[PDB]
Amino acid sequence: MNTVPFTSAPIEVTIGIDQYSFNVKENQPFHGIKDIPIGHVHVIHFQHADNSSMRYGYWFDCRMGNFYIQYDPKDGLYKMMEERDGAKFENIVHNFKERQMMVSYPKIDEDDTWYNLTEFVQMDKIRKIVRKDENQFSYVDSSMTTVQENELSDPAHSLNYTVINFKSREAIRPGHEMEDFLDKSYYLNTVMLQGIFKNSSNYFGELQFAFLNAMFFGNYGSSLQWHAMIELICSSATVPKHMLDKLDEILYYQIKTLPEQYSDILLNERVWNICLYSSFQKNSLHNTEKIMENKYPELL
């Protein structure tokens, strides 16, 4: 069980750790988060009480180093940093634990929600989508644009999601225009799965990461990426049976977790209606269709 200490909390802030969140008061003696489950990526995220604009946060894996948070009064944010001195870090963490100035990652034993949202998400794949190779953790915020959004402006601070475009030469084989446009199996199975992602795990990993960035930071480009990757599978007549069964589980936990009040801005009516009711896979997502119909029947 791993720890992300905080130097201090000089500004009032809502702190997120995965799907959990805590209010911290200006200069509250808060020194971080302990008992973080090893084996998963995690995201620590922030919304200042004084600027409910710019949600921002850090994807990290405690197996990859010793990370702490320290407020930077110049840049005006909570920054993740790596402590290379293992002894200095253990000494810092032991003191803060002894003084009980840390919140405990509040996982219920029965509860597989975080595992189910992050099953295929790997830090090494996050670091390719969010390029900043001098750090072992990845910064994301509300306003970061995707490589695809930048085509239709600062490449350094972009989300490098795989570009999916249903009306592109990549998506459409010369002389199979109608076939490839109405049945996207070629695009999914040969171009994306065999060509770019290499396997369904990497594809689901990107899908899951796009969802989480959409949900935690209200990142619009991430929301577009999550929907495009769903729609590419649902619009393919030929999908491995294991991918459909897993997709149904992935989407079920995402819909289950989404705040009820954000359904209107995070869920694309057209895509969900098409995927559940019109698409080739309209009858392949039983769990997802049942939770959507019971939780968001307005959208449909």
Place this chain on the structure above:
Amino acid sequence: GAMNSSNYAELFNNDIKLFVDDTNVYRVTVHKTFEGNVATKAINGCIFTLNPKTGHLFLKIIHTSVWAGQKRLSQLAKWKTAEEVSALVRSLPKEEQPKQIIVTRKAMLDPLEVHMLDFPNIAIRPTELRLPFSAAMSIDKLSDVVMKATEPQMVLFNIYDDWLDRISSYTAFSRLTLLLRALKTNEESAKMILLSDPTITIKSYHLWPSFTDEQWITIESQMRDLILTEYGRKYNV
């Protein structure tokens, strides 16, 4: 974006453009079978692809053989249209390729956009205009070449005959749309108006009669009267 009454003069500028109408691509007769079920029998169709500036009509005849053993023909008809328009653009020298293609029905946008991905600089546009190009098969010489085709065939016409020697492309397009609107509203009445005076003939290389300027004004008046009458009848106004 969409072509409408507000950007109408764009049709007559020096940017090459084509209207594509797919209405007459997939045509059927509905009939009773011996068992008293209903069946369709396809008849020959055509893509109506028109340069509104020059009057050049690229009439691609769609032979019934293209539907043999195909499913969802009304959907295939949009894709076959888009394939044939794409083939036509590729067949034209670069300096003759259109800068815009305007589709008369929105269901043609995706099929045409997907077939024209090789031409990212050609703008595919819908229109707000209710253009009567569906009535093209009421022009005797166009109907005749479609119904006689025994194979796929492209036939080239000038839908304005020699009008551009005397009038602008704006006026030529207004006359064409009034003639087609009349033929669409009441074909029999429209055709009676066009042919009632046997002294005015259709040249072998033309589609419409050889009206003087004065006779065109009278003809144009008779077609507007036909359209308003039929409107009062349609709507009990």
